[PDB]
Amino acid sequence: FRNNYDGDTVTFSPTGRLFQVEYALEAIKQGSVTVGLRSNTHAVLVALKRNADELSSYQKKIIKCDEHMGLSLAGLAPDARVLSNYLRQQCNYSSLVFNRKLAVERAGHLLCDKAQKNTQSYGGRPYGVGLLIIGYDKSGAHLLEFQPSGNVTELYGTAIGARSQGAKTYLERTLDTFIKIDGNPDELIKAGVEAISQSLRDESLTVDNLSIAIVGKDTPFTIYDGEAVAKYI
Amino acid sequence: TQQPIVTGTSVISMKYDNGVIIAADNLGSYGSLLRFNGVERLIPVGDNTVVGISGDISDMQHIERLLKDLVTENAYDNPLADAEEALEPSYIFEYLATVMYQRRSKMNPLWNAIIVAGVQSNGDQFLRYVNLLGVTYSSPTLATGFGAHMANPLLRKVVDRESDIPKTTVQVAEEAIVNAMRVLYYRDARSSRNFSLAIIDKNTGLTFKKNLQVENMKWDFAKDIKGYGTQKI
Lengths: 233, 233
Prior knowledge:
Number of helices of chain A: 6
Structural class of chain A: alpha+beta
CATH architecture of chain B: 4-Layer Sandwich
CATH superfamily of chain A: Aminohydrolase, N-terminal nucleophile (Ntn) domain
Protein name (chain B): Proteasome subunit beta type-7
Order of helices and strands of chain B: EEEEEEEHHEEEEHHEE
CATH topology of chain A: Glutamine Phosphoribosylpyrophosphate, subunit 1, domain 1
Keywords (chain B): Cytoplasm, Nucleus, Proteasome
CATH superfamily of chain B: Aminohydrolase, N-terminal nucleophile (Ntn) domain
Oligomer: part of a larger assembly
Subcellular location (chain B): Cytoplasm; Nucleus
GO cellular component, one term (chain B): nucleus
Keywords (chain A): Cytoplasm, Isopeptide bond, Nucleus, Phosphoprotein, Proteasome, Ubl conjugation
């Protein structure tokens, strides 16, 4: 079965599946966990940076796309770089040509479309990375979940990566609570770190291991790493 | 590189305390031939912007089409197309300015002078000019072609600097513009008596007036003028 229909992305299986796409999705699950959630005034990204050795660094998992937008990745880092770069250009184009900040919902549509092309044509491969996009535009705070299949969804919060299901159930529970954390970033972040710790197991989030990013009303997307996240451990 | 064939003359405008006013006659000249009289050179975009165009009429029609497409496109996958994500006057201008400069840079310009008048979502007045060279600028009053020489001096006697804006009413402002239109009909050999005028008020919205006419003209003193020097009868 499967073996005969998963040699490339241009082949449907007898049940209507696209294995190459599915295998790509598997790269995300293998990726380190990262969480995203928002109130009505801010959006936060909390990501667990994974290290190779104890002599190695903890790979960055958050990229800023513009002053009002940014994302977190889980999976093939290179693909995240390619996709965020594309997002940076799209944000840029909107500003230069229309003097308009790109709508988070529009960015999601663009990413979906860019990924889709890599699932219907011979020779290419699907992107092997998941992305959580947060931003503050003319309609407030926003959080988006991007999957290599090209499916992009807007949520109040979520998580992707290994053991992500932990943080996800927690947020699906804490919903009514954090969604009202307006005017108070520190609280939103703390709630973000509480959702992420729900996916720990191996170790515990340290200083050079935790990565946080926030954006909102009067806060340009900024990234906090190391000492800057100490007050949250 | 080209040469304008059918042309529209002056486009005059100014801003008052609650919005902006913009007017343009309804003539489409062909050299010294006043060929077309039902030409509308004021292009409304949505209900917060009006684009006034002078210069080549075939290019104006082209810009018109570009503008309609902007509206259509902006509505695509945009649930807030008639709200937070509707076209702002500043987006429309930045777009046109971009096109104008690109076209002059390819040595194939859109032979026009354009004034974008409107009110931003935060209520701010918007008035900016762009021409075939990609040149842009803002001032409390703006006029193209002949109107730059004869209208600006008159309109500036009302709003000579920024601080005069809040002190100027729609009545006063509309009066100035209507007077200026009459002056242009007196001294501009490529003008028409019929014109359109539009008001964009942050409270009353967009008011588009068609088929206006220059009235209250002084010609009687002409009977007293005979000869060109010494002739008595």
